[PDB]
Design an enzyme around this catalytic site. Sequence first.
Site, PDB file in Angstrom:
ATOM      1  N   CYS A  32       0.842  -1.228   0.000  1.00 49.61           N
ATOM      2  CA  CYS A  32       0.000   0.000   0.000  1.00 49.61           C
ATOM      3  C   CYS A  32       0.845   1.232   0.000  1.00 49.61           C
ATOM      4  O   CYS A  32       1.515   1.657   0.954  1.00 49.61           O
ATOM      5  CB  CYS A  32      -1.003  -0.137   1.181  1.00 49.61           C
ATOM      6  N   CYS A  35      -0.097   4.036   2.391  1.00 52.46           N
ATOM      7  CA  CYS A  35       0.219   3.589   3.787  1.00 52.46           C
ATOM      8  C   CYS A  35       1.654   3.923   4.131  1.00 52.46           C
ATOM      9  O   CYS A  35       1.943   4.360   5.222  1.00 52.46           O
ATOM     10  CB  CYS A  35       0.034   2.090   3.958  1.00 52.46           C
TER      11      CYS A  35
END
Length: 108
Positions: A32, A35
Amino acid sequence: SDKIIHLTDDSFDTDVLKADGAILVDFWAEWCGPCKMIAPILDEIADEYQGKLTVAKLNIDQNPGTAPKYGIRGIPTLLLFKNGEVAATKVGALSKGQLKEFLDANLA
Ligand SMILES: [Cu+2]
């Protein structure tokens, strides 16, 4: 990353639900991108709010059981727990200033 708690599916209740004080939980995965963009901001917040907030992480690839219980649909998702319950949530990346405002709105 030295001040971030490492969570697992089995440790969640003990570490989060029975926590003393507010705990911010970051749901992430290595694939991600957004993230990884907020990881440093979480380290800054962990230092700045030390003593008033605990920050923790749960990698959803390694612990797939927790996210579904909170109806998480995308990552990053931040859950703010107080007294064993979700007090507030924020989905998606955000800046340090936005994170601070989100925390201040919920910590008192
Ligand atoms: Cu650190």
